[PDB]
């Protein structure tokens, strides 16, 4: 598979007045690991991150063009972007290459800068917006992640249990995927702060 | 898919089945297969389902504006030449064999077979669709020079009912149309009104 | 999608002499297993000092000469003289190359005199490379004529032979003998033989029949 | 006036005229004159050659167009060379497509179509040239005359400066031309051009050019040595 | 219009090199655009002066002044407009 | 066009002393079906050129349109020139080859016959641009079944009278009806002479099936 | 005046002067008349030959624009050949698209729109020529349409264009064109051309005549030589 | 087809055979497989003939334009790079070329390998062709920078001889050119069958 | 197949490349330089499909030199590496460049920088990197002995262990190896390691 | 204002006449045809001793067999001489022979009246080239001299003067010329007439001269070779 050439594994999970987003750190070519500190989650605001799994060169291409369009939007507009507008901008940008598609399935996890409602969504690789109320997962270990997140997610959790659930849901899923893993970063987006953590994970 | 048009003195009689299949599942069993291009000019749609509507919208567009400019009811040969030009110009991307039938005051009842290719030929009767192979031999044997209106309606209903009996990709109701100077009289033959031919049972 | 070439057969033959050039061709035109016509000459007079030979696909053989005569008359307008043999060859090399990625399936053999009154044979590929030779066979039956001319003109594999220059009376009989040898063994060559001899007086023709089968 | 109606070809003057078109005919009414005429078998052009300085040789006033057509110039020379390359291209496209040379009567209508288009569009100028076109085809020999985009079929015709006397001489002697041979035909045109000269100048081997086309003779320009038998001749002025 | 153009220039640079643009490149780019309309095209020229402040890692805090002719200069204090 | 659908089979032609006669059946096949039985595959271009085409029939009607509009736009000038059949043959060679060069051919194999300046013209053009003249022409299965009879008669006697050439054409069309699967016993004959172009038809051939009693 | 250097500029009283100056340029040129009758259309043109050096057939003012349609022109003739080629291309495109010969009403209203398209812009000039179109078919009858350079087109029983238009129009009005055969119409046409002729100014002229009708089965043809010459003879003896 | 060229102390020696083939059929034995660019430069023929000939003729036109405009002859490093920029655009359309550019510039000798695959390298020795692998073995065992001129002629002719002896697809005539500082000069033109008698 | 290796230290980057140019069974150049000087503080190591490599490298090189001409100062290695990544990424076009790249650079403010890049133009900054099939044999030794505080003599020793692994185990004949080092004093050429 | 394509009442384009007026300000050129070849001489007109005289070039190589003189606005002769060189090299590329001088002069004079402001392939010419030229060369017809002007009207010459001092130098070239004149004598009389018309004082520093022969190529004279004929004065 062309999506599975680099591996990749990003998920989000919705809490009580806070969201969590985590991404795998392996940058790979089909069998060969190259580095273990690859960036997949990008800051698009104070309380809004986008995470892109899949082909890593399409991750960096879409993140550069998205930052190009978003900086123009925020300079011309004079405000921070609301996450639904970012979802429609990303879906527009991916659908402009409909028959030439970028090989990335971005997830978006952040907080509304005015109302602070939690927002989680993902997309396909061609631009279908899928707003869910529990979690979205993306990458080559999709089945491994849905198996964890259907059972460990519970509604209305504090940031501690949100961290614990997204941590276990990442770790036991990526320990069953060969071409993904090698370290994981966890971002906890809250009302007053952003918490950036890395976890103990298998390195094989 | 079985369409048929028969020229008689004073107009034409059209006929069509009503079964549109995708694979072997009937997607629509009340399909209307007679499209009015002008008041008294009908085209019939066999082959690719998209093309025979998409070209027909362009031909209706050209022919209505042409008729308004010329202050004349448009000819059937004009409506056939606008298909002969355009279905030829895109024949690699169209799969369209059209049977145009209609009436005009200048030359009477007219049936033009435009086969898949973008040519044009006037015939006394024209059959088309996937089912027409099973009723070539009927209409070569039954057609007489100069049938009346009701004899043509019974001839079109019999020839369609044979193809609907034999071809699995055809069936439903028989939608007829008789186009003449007085206007268009359409009628639908359903159930018992479809002409019935008993099976070749063992004695 | 439209297999766009048909090998329409034929062989052409050119020999550069001391003060002449002989160009010969069959006139049978073929298409697989059929004979289209028995009088279709392949020698096309360009100017007074150059006759060209054609072999290969016949549609390109017609189209290319309708290009070349136009280019000759453009030259005769813009330069106020007829083209030399080397000028025609250098022109046709560019013309054949400009159709690089859809080539004229034509093997051109230009025969004629240069400006010094010697024979020059210029034999080309479809993609425009060219070279000067003393003699050349082309087209379908080239492998039956070219070793015999290698024996008789270049005098290879012969010991105790005087390398006499190319006289006309021996060369004409050589052309007739090699075409009888081609017509006996190749199916594509036959039905006539049209011979153009380029000398300083002008261009003349001689016709000999071949095998009809 | 004079001044706001002579600046554009696309302005009708209130008499129903276009002053930029009529000024373009002054470019043909100033040029070195030329004489054309035909028989039932031949068509011949006679032209003065303008050599600019006595060490400068003579301006070509007859141009090769094909084997079967030659033209003459009077006026803006580079416009006539543009139109020569046009006619070269048209005869070559007719030979390339239909494998017979284009008939002259259609080719001059194509020239009349080409010169017409700048006479109507803003920012353009009319071609400042008049031509005499000598050709031979299936319909026999032809002499044509083309600035204002008109074109004329002519038995014998002379354009250029002071050309009225040459037109009167050709009106006097056009009744002979059909049955004259090739030799007498050019002699009449040499006298017709000799009408146009000032009294002291004579027709020499250097300042008279001749083009000749016939039933089996391809078109050829007759210059310095080739003009000498046709010059001799000659009834003196 | 010109400050809509300036943002496109600076974001094309930040797109292409993934670092923010040096302060003089933006000013010379806009003076190239303002110079182009004074020479050809037959339009009217823009009638605006623009004072330019900005920081970069190469020379730190800077100042510029531009005109409709396409000139620019570095300044430590300057003034445009009335008086 | 990549797919010929409505096709026409063999077209014959032979020069005779004073003109050219060509012939063709009146069938448009659709695969194996005899779908159209009363189409004409012979075009009268002007008073001295006729044209018959085998192969795809839609491209023949496109050439009827273009080559009719050419001779009408010639006759609008009214200068006394008419296209000699060699000019129409060269034009068709260039049009068929120019369609070939775009990888978009006109799937035909055409025979131009004419009579101008007292000289008969008979010229062949196929979908590639292979073009030549011959004393007799035959496209399709006529090239194997009717061409040998034409050249066998022409070897003994190179000059044919009009009725001899007409019966030779009829006797070749009988052969094609006996031995071509896509032919039809309803054919046209078009003859150009000094007086101009006539088309006679529909004609029919009379069969002989006495070998059907020669099984046992 | 300042208001007449451009066709894209109205004058303060509401006139477009480049068009009204082109309609003065039309009535500089020689007389051309056309008479529609019961079964066909006959055209007649006073063809001046400015010098007898000129061959016959030069400066024809009768054009064929389709095989069933003819055309007679007046004015600056170099524009008229361009409009003849526009009408030829328009009738050719109509035959190619719609499969039959173009109705003359629609052809006149295509060519009238092409003429009108130049009376709007400063980047072109209006045509300096008026022209007529005549046709015949079994389905449509005979028809005669006349266009002036303003683009305005109407259908006519009889028309005269050129420098002698009014004296010819009053003379065409004297005739009963509606009920005569065309072989009886050529003699009037030839009568009126020699009547309105200016013989003291711009001498040495020729008559040019053509008809389309049932007697040519709708094909537009020139008048034969003996019929044209006996029309010339009848008109010269009527002229005294 | 086998071509080789090598730099040494007194310039560049270029040697080539003369056999062009059409499958198993041999079409010619007199192919000039060193193409004469100008009075100071040589190009070589391997793979496709017309593909070599057109681009090297157009390069000769290009460097003559450069001599007219910049008033100085072209260097090897510029001219071979222009050949690379011409042939780089048409990768993958079916071109076949193997070339060596040999001249004398201000860096001294010049010898660069450019092909239709896009490779552009320097080197002291090269060999290109179908039977080039046999030419490398005979060439490199005698090669050094301190070769004498006539011994370099003998080494070049011997390497082309053994390359023609082993390759079925190579043969013809051993053509030998020598580029020096004052221009290129023809050394000899020798049949293979005579050198079999000599060796 | 061509070989690349680069090691990023505390205030230096050490890169090395094989010095072989091959043609399908034989090598045609044994002094082949795959290191192209971009500017005073930056090298781009270039391997991959032939022709694409040199054209792409020189096209980047003249734009880096052109930026220096327009501005009077050098690109940062981050900016030049993202520029090279953008030009290689603009892949799905009619001009794909199948090139494999390492870029080594030194900045005044950020220090030594090493960038890995494949033919997809995936840009990954790494403390050490290597291309070719020979990378599969020596990234294990680089994982064994590399520490972030390796001084340059241990770097040349570990590089010598890596090239001896190429000599002992790797099947392609890679006998001679060119090495350069970049630091705050510009570019430095070191002695060739031969076997 | 009015267009660049406006006819005067005399039938002359105004711009075509005014470019001929810009001819009459240029450095005067002298070219003479002989049977042993053609010699061409143009005055450099050095304006300052700070100027390098060698970098002024008013006689150019066109190919190995064709020279060319110029007078007037030398910046127009930049694009004219470069299109002439491209045409000669295209003729060598296509036909593998030398281009004759007449076809070269026809090709260059086509670029004259390829000007105008409405057809306008993107940024082509808006005014006539105000340079008149003398083409001297040798071909298969032998040594020849051609003359060209801003009207695009080209013609053959035996000797010609162009420019500011064209008038009297044309009559003096009428005086000296005979068809049996040698090349060295033509160099001699060309420097005679140029020294008659130069305001400055003639030496090897303020003229250029070159010759083309059937035997040898186009050869621009060096300073010592100029000095050698200049000693004869």
CSV table of C-alpha atoms in Angstrom, one decimal, chain I residues 5-111:
chain,number,residue,atom,x,y,z
I,5,UNK,CA,27.0,8.4,5.0
I,6,UNK,CA,26.9,11.5,7.3
I,7,UNK,CA,27.5,12.0,11.0
I,8,UNK,CA,26.3,15.1,12.9
I,9,UNK,CA,28.3,16.0,15.9
I,10,UNK,CA,28.2,18.7,18.6
I,11,UNK,CA,29.7,21.5,16.5
I,12,UNK,CA,30.6,19.6,13.3
I,13,UNK,CA,29.1,17.4,10.6
I,14,UNK,CA,31.2,14.6,9.1
I,15,UNK,CA,30.0,13.3,5.7
I,16,UNK,CA,31.5,10.7,3.3
I,17,UNK,CA,30.5,9.3,0.0
I,18,UNK,CA,31.7,6.5,-2.3
I,19,UNK,CA,33.9,7.6,-5.2
I,20,UNK,CA,32.7,5.2,-7.9
I,21,UNK,CA,30.6,5.7,-11.0
I,22,UNK,CA,29.4,2.4,-12.5
I,23,UNK,CA,27.9,1.3,-15.9
I,24,UNK,CA,26.0,-2.0,-15.5
I,25,UNK,CA,28.9,-4.5,-14.9
I,26,UNK,CA,31.8,-2.1,-14.9
I,27,UNK,CA,32.8,1.1,-13.1
I,28,UNK,CA,33.6,4.0,-15.4
I,29,UNK,CA,35.0,6.5,-12.8
I,30,UNK,CA,37.1,5.9,-9.7
I,31,UNK,CA,37.5,9.6,-8.7
I,32,UNK,CA,33.8,10.5,-8.8
I,33,UNK,CA,32.8,13.5,-6.6
I,34,UNK,CA,29.3,13.4,-5.3
I,35,UNK,CA,29.8,16.4,-3.0
I,36,UNK,CA,28.7,19.6,-4.6
I,37,UNK,CA,29.6,22.9,-2.8
I,38,UNK,CA,26.4,24.9,-2.2
I,39,UNK,CA,28.0,27.7,-0.3
I,40,UNK,CA,30.7,28.3,2.3
I,41,UNK,CA,28.8,26.3,5.1
I,42,UNK,CA,26.7,23.8,3.2
I,43,UNK,CA,27.2,20.7,1.1
I,44,UNK,CA,24.6,18.6,-0.6
I,45,UNK,CA,25.4,14.9,-1.1
I,46,UNK,CA,23.7,13.6,-4.3
I,47,UNK,CA,23.0,10.0,-5.4
I,48,UNK,CA,20.3,8.3,-7.3
I,49,UNK,CA,19.2,7.9,-10.9
I,50,UNK,CA,21.8,9.3,-13.3
I,51,UNK,CA,21.1,12.7,-14.9
I,52,UNK,CA,18.4,13.6,-12.5
I,53,UNK,CA,21.1,14.0,-9.8
I,54,UNK,CA,23.4,16.5,-11.5
I,55,UNK,CA,20.7,18.6,-13.1
I,56,UNK,CA,18.7,18.9,-9.8
I,57,UNK,CA,21.8,19.6,-7.8
I,58,UNK,CA,23.1,22.3,-10.1
I,59,UNK,CA,19.6,23.8,-10.4
I,60,UNK,CA,19.5,24.1,-6.6
I,61,UNK,CA,23.1,25.3,-6.5
I,62,UNK,CA,22.6,28.3,-8.8
I,63,UNK,CA,19.5,29.4,-6.9
I,64,UNK,CA,21.5,29.3,-3.6
I,65,UNK,CA,24.3,31.2,-5.2
I,66,UNK,CA,21.7,33.6,-6.7
I,67,UNK,CA,20.2,34.2,-3.3
I,68,UNK,CA,23.7,35.1,-2.1
I,69,UNK,CA,24.0,37.5,-5.0
I,70,UNK,CA,20.6,39.1,-4.4
I,71,UNK,CA,21.0,39.5,-0.7
I,72,UNK,CA,24.7,39.5,0.3
I,73,UNK,CA,24.4,36.6,2.7
I,74,UNK,CA,23.9,32.9,2.7
I,75,UNK,CA,20.9,30.7,3.1
I,76,UNK,CA,20.6,29.0,6.5
I,77,UNK,CA,20.7,25.2,6.1
I,78,UNK,CA,17.1,24.9,7.3
I,79,UNK,CA,16.0,27.3,4.5
I,80,UNK,CA,18.1,25.7,1.8
I,81,UNK,CA,17.0,22.2,2.9
I,82,UNK,CA,13.3,23.2,2.8
I,83,UNK,CA,14.0,24.9,-0.6
I,84,UNK,CA,15.5,21.7,-2.0
I,85,UNK,CA,12.6,19.8,-0.5
I,86,UNK,CA,10.0,22.1,-2.1
I,87,UNK,CA,11.7,21.9,-5.5
I,88,UNK,CA,12.0,18.1,-5.3
I,89,UNK,CA,8.3,17.9,-4.1
I,90,UNK,CA,7.0,20.0,-7.0
I,91,UNK,CA,7.3,14.4,-7.9
I,92,UNK,CA,3.7,14.2,-9.2
I,93,UNK,CA,4.6,16.6,-12.1
I,94,UNK,CA,5.9,15.9,-15.6
I,95,UNK,CA,9.4,16.2,-14.2
I,96,UNK,CA,10.0,13.6,-11.5
I,97,UNK,CA,13.5,13.6,-10.0
I,98,UNK,CA,14.4,10.2,-8.6
I,99,UNK,CA,17.3,11.5,-6.5
I,100,UNK,CA,18.5,10.5,-3.0
I,101,UNK,CA,20.0,13.3,-0.9
I,102,UNK,CA,21.9,14.2,2.2
I,103,UNK,CA,22.5,17.8,3.1
I,104,UNK,CA,25.0,18.9,5.7
I,105,UNK,CA,25.2,22.5,6.9
I,106,UNK,CA,26.5,24.7,9.7
I,107,UNK,CA,24.6,27.8,10.9
I,108,UNK,CA,25.9,30.5,13.2
I,109,UNK,CA,22.8,30.4,15.4
I,110,UNK,CA,21.7,26.8,15.2
I,111,UNK,CA,25.0,25.0,14.7
